[PDB]
Amino acid sequence: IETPITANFREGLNVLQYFISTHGARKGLADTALKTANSGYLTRRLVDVA
Amino acid sequence: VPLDGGRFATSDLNDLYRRVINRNNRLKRLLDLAAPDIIVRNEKRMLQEAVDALLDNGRRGRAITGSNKRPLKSLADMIKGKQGRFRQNLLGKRVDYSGRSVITVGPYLRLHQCGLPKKMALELFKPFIYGKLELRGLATTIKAAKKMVEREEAVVWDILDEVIREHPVLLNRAPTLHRLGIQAFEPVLIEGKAIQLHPLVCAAYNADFDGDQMAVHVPLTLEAQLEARALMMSTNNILSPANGEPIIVPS
Amino acid sequence: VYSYTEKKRIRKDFGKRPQVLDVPYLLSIQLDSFQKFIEQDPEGQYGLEAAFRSVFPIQSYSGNSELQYVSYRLGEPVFDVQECQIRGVTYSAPLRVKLRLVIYEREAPEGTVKDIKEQEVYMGEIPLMTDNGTFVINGTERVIVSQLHRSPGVFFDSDKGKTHSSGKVLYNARIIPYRGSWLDFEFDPKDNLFVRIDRRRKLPATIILRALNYTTEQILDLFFEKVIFEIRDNKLQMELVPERLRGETASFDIEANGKVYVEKGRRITARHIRQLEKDDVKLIEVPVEYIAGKVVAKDYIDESTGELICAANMELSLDLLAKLSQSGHKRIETLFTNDLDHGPYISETLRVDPTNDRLSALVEIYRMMRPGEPPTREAAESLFENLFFSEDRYDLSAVGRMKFNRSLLREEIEGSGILSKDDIIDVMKKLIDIRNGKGEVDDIDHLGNRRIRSVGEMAENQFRVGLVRVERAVKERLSLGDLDTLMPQDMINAKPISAAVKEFFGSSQLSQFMDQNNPLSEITHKRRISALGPGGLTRERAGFEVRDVHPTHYGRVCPIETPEGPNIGLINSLSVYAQTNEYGFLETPYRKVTDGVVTDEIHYLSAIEEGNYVIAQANSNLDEEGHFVEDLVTCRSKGESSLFSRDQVDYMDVSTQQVVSVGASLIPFLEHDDANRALMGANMQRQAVPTLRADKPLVGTGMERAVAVDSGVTAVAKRGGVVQYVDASRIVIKVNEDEMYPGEAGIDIYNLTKYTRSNQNTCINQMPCVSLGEPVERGDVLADGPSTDLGELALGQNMRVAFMPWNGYNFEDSILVSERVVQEDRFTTIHIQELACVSRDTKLGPEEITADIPNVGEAALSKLDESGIVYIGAEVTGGDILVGKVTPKGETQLTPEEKLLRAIFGEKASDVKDSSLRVPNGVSGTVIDVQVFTRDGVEKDKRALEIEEMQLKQAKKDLSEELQILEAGLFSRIRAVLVAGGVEAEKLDKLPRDRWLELGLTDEEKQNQLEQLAEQYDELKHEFEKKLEAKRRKITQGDDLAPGVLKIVKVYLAVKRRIQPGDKMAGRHGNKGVISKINPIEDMPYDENGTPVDIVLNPLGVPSRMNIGQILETHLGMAAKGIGDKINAMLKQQQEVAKLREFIQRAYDLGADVRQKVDLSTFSDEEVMRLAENLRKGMPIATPVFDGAKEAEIKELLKLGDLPTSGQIRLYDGRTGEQFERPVTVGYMYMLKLNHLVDDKMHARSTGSYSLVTQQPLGGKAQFGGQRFGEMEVWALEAYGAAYTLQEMLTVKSDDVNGRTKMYKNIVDGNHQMEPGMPESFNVLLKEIRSLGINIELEDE
Amino acid sequence: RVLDATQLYLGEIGYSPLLTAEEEVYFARRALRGDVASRRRMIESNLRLVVKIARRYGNRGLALLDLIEEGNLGLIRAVEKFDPERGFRFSTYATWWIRQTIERAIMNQTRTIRLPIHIVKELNVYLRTARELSHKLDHEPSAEEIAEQLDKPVDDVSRMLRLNERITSVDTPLGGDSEKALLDILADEKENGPEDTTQDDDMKQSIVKWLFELNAKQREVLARRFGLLGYEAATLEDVGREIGLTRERVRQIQVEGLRRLREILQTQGLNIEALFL
DNA sequence: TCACGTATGCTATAATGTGGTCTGACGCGG
DNA sequence: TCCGCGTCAGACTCGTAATTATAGCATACGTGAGG
RNA sequence: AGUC
């Protein structure tokens, strides 16, 4: 994102900085649910080969 | 099989076999009747459709939908999928003398110990109790030993304490990414329903006590006990097998 | 100006931004939507009206007979919600529909003067929505979640690369109707326009135009601009349009008049263009060589021969030009196609098009959808017209037509549901415009393109399906039957419609068990939006783009509330102020800014409308009753945010809260919390089990009261007035004259729901808030629901918390709790479990519910009464029998041992087994209630009969007290009317009230009032009779049960569960923990004052988590309690009302720029001491979300409590007595006990039952299951050595049948030897492979 | 790319000749006399009728193709028992046969647990009655309400509606997602747990040891009666076949063996302990 | 030889070609 | 080049248990029990 | 519908 968050958590985000935060946060959380699968599929391919 | 409700429940293979038999027998009939060839052909197409559905449904185009709309599970589907029989029932299985509960800290524990709830351990070591009860002659037979455990008599606790002594238990956490996701401990009987984990091994399990749970498994044979104490014990698996560094590290 | 329930306890507000619009009713969506479905509208096609007019009138295939719809009506519900929940039936209204069978003569042309038969037919019961927003389906409360789908209309999308490593962007149009086949247009790498009907095989786009009757020359005239070529004398000329060249390179020397403008081989800039245009250039001389390549527009033929020289859309040459000249054509219309802006796409597509005429095109279309089947002309016209041009099979809907027309830049919103020939061409035109470079692609994730379907639309659709299934049956029977004997009801079937709707409200993915752990859980569940289920996305289909936060989600959808799971991003909580537009788009309120001054004029803007205006931020500073203080205001437009001047500002955010959803609004210092942790915080608040004592939150936001009221779980006063009678069961209020209607008696009765079971087996208990003889207004809380304090929402309990390590007892988020918490029964929770015992009829004979049970101790039978039912109030523990039941066994061929054993005790005990319902193992509770459902024919149990005696007499008492309090309250009014114009005070009280039918006064308005009260009295008199007969019938009614089932006994257990190690607790900043140890009071860190801390949480689980909200909550919580401790001290010493008033006014009016004013004074002394008594257990404070309390305000509040500004205190170790070496942060965190109790999660198994085919042990604690030893877990044993442990796990522990029994016997024999075998799962595998016809033998040694 | 069995078959049927009245009469006379071609042509030409009937009663049990083949069997019986001498048309007579064979097949094959036409016909009347009741009673038919209308036994109506209960798939995963199939919930009932089987082993082993603890003549007429040691479970009177050859002395000695054994269970620690069992 | 569920049989106006979900992705053959 | 088939992590918890429609009656076929 |  071209606009960074100037503020910190002690300062408190404003509505716009918090909303902008959300994107990164949720992509992180979705990553754990969805990508774990490809990581884990690589473990399983490796295990079968060796 | 009959459900309790008086209803029956059956495999989809029965629906696929019935398809095949109906069309096959109808083909025998139409051959006995010397039917015109257009109709014989239709029946031969339909017979091949039914057998192909029975072997591998969905490969030959549009799979035969049963009751909900879902395609009937065919023979190949019971072998093939991850869910088949290989991955589900054979390369891994459900296991006896297995339990689980929420984990919680045991800062007082030594590295080779884990808090195992009384009621959980009572149940896991049932045959081992029955056995000592009969060697002490406190239980006349197995059904009397079972009823003494059901009544949770005071002498039974003392016997259970005696069995668990020097008997290792396997703790497992999902996901098991590397081998240290299973470790053996000597159990410590504790009043209360939560498993107590030694902090220093929390690293290997990636265990944090905000509600994580663990599987408990009892190695039954002398061989399995020894493999747990020598190979899989917490104390003996200090260094990561991945890199040389100690995994058992204060944090 | 505060309400009565607020006078009892006022929350201090640190908010500064005045709220111009109040939080709306939160359960708006569910109610409005369903209300539209059932709502009787004559015109406005909504729900059923629309459904009937759409399908009906249904006329027969012969055309003699037709069935037409008149009107419908919902019968009143057979069973109330209560009886439905107990009995396990759907709460529904019978649908009766008036229908008219009209018949025509075949001999007369269309004579309708034969037979018109009109009657009211039953078509199903429709499930009704509760006033809360739920449906009760088979005795279970369920919520149907609103859906989010792609709005019908047009969409222009493009594979950004993907196909062809060429890396070509292929543009496409998709026309999506509400009902019908999809119409796709797309480009190919070679720039050929293609049509996919119903995403079948590809066809050239021009073919669809031929089917719509377009000649080649007409097609070209539609997409292409014509360029005229005049052939004068010998030189070639062409009619020039000054711009056309524009940004092209001049291939010839361009000469105009006599004078050379362009140089050959140079690029024509703006100067050349304006020079040529101003000179008025219309002919330019050109070389003959330039036409080689130009495309002819029309068919040009030789007027001499009359044969075609060149067909339309043909590439010209020097020889075709020559032939054209000599034939006598000196004007040639050619296509303008200059690459770049004007691409020849349709020209090239016509050359790819194999079809010639209309028929040839219709045949090819017909052959695509129905490949093989020979064309007929009738068939091809019929199919093509029935695709997109039939009113019955195609319907864009109003929203489809509206979004379609706006996408094609039309003026008119409303129009035809069927596609016009002009529609299709306009769509193709826009596609091609986008390819050229003018025009842009629509975005699918944009909320302007995602529409909300709440319930009513979905119930409507399922109901249409039911009707359609009926139409086939109906039309079929109208043609076959004789018309005159046959009435309409013999043709209609109710079971198809009932089945369609039943399957929606019961089988559907969107219909789910309401999440009722707590009020917030309910309210948030009912305002859920799911992109999943039918007509939506799937988890497989769902990418990463849809899941992420879209810019348009601002003010409509919560960015921070979504399941952390596979459903992440598909399921969304609605924002606070958000609402559905008339078409079903989401919209958000905004304050209109006029001439820079910010009005209170409030406009709801849709996703598309929002893009157009510049909207200032809510935090933007307004200047005292006019414009913005600051010159450059921070605003947002075009989906992005920056500074603007004041004149540019159009609008502004209504509240600071509108971005956030309900659940997240309840998080205090959200502003200081990481969005991830905040998400899980809002998610865990839904998991909070209500404690025995519902404790308010000291650090709140203000949404607390809104949520408690709107959830419906609180009893709220409609009429108000003074409370006549309180009871732990009921509240009767006497209404005030101003709202009290002069017709019916003005006494409101609210019956409170006592200790009832939730879906999650939590406890639902309503207690009375107000005291006897309390004056109350409309909208005052009369009774508190389960997790509500005086009107406010109370999900858990606030506690004295200290952040510091203990001896590893708070290691990784592990929680150290004081014994005092357990003693005070805080976080003690109530669970009400419903167990049923079913008496069925088997092939051997009916099962008996006698107390006479083979092989049972007197200890067990003590607790059962005559019938075999446990007594009310009886405490029970695992294995105790609740309802005794025995099942008939067939002739038992016994093992010799059993023959001997049965001979020894002689307890042959007849031909019967023991199938008694007994308490599940380890659960232990008190029996609160018992229900008996019998059928009709079978002789009732003695205990069932005494239960009905109780229900009958109790019913009689209930109804009797209704008529008595209603008659007393009604004559109390007549008494006041009679005094009006007839003083008889003492004289009227002496004669009996029963003989007051004679009493009147003079004929005025007051005599008419007496008539109203007298007609009501008698109405209530008969009403009481028919009510009592209904109750009596339902109590006697052998309810109709499942086939096979003779009777059912439902036992309700009440369990009190104590907090304990393993139980899961969290705060509201997503900060979880499992309790590790309960510490004695002596051991816990204590203050200088000697007061021990309740909970010791680990400091190290804050800076990593970046939820700083919990720390601010703790500092403010201590400050709140500081002031409560001062008020508690002043109340203990009585002191002066004047002095308390002083302190409390200075307190409420503390904050730097406090919005909330509290001019204490006006409060009467009695109001003030009731207020102080509530403020004593800590002054409750509200920190709005994004407009919260500042650190400086919190430190100022702490100074008012004489607590430290650091909010750190000196602590002393309970054990040693010595001080901790540095100050510790202590204060009050509001904590929650989640549903995850160790009691329910702890499970263990040695040996049990085993699976049917695979012979492996079952899964799950309910089935007494073994833990799954997965691939992952196996690999661990493989990495180690452990080969015996692995084999054990594979063989004697799972399948190996012989092995497991043998090894069990060995372990009791103490041999600890395995003796392995072959896993039965493998034996199955073999059999399954041989069933495939593969020989899989096992070669022996 | 015509691959579908149905579309192929319907293509083949369309390619047939449509018969007239006089043509039907000519072919029908030759057909009954036993013409090969006449039978084939009448069947092939009238396949169209089967389809317009099998497609009519669709989504009721079997699939169109399956409903078309069985319907074709009706066509054959129709051509076999057609009377060309009667002026009345073939289509009229055939419609009966095609509907009959389709309905009969749909009544048998459709239900996994096979149901007799007699019960099916009874069921039909119960269901039609339920429909008329539902139209006037806004609620649905009770078993007793249906029984009252037909003047039949409540028990008989209940038995019938029980047989209507259609079958739940075991292989079908239930938990919304493919989480767990019903198979894995439902345990093997006929198979005892290792706990129960081991308990029977203990009793059996104990019996052998209990037989060599009482009198030699007290465990020779007690076990040989119950069939514990002996081969066949005899009665008091039948123990006479061995060596006992008594009726009174066998009954006194059987009970004498059990009385001494009752005190062996009171002392070991069972009797009333193992009475609950 | 009947009792009882099951099965086969015939009805004769004419009628004669069928009719749910629609969007994953990145790899690797044929 | 385009269609087809193949993979996509690992356990755990709950909760519930549906719908349709096939006419109506007379002789024919099989087994067991009673006279 | 959830829990790691």
Ligand SMILES: O=c1ccn([C@@H]2O[C@H](COP(=O)(O)OP(=O)(O)OP(=O)(O)O)[C@@H](O)[C@H]2O)c(=O)[nH]1
């Ligand atoms: O979706 C999930 C979540 C968690 N887990 C497993 O459970 C563990 C606990 O999941 P947590 O959410 O507690 O994460 P964490 O301990 O890694 O980090 P904190 O937020 O607590 O600081 C994870 O580390 C992983 O091993 C999963 O397997 N899947």
Ligand SMILES: [Mg+2]
């Ligand atoms: Mg964690």
Ligand SMILES: [Mg+2]
């Ligand atoms: Mg965790």
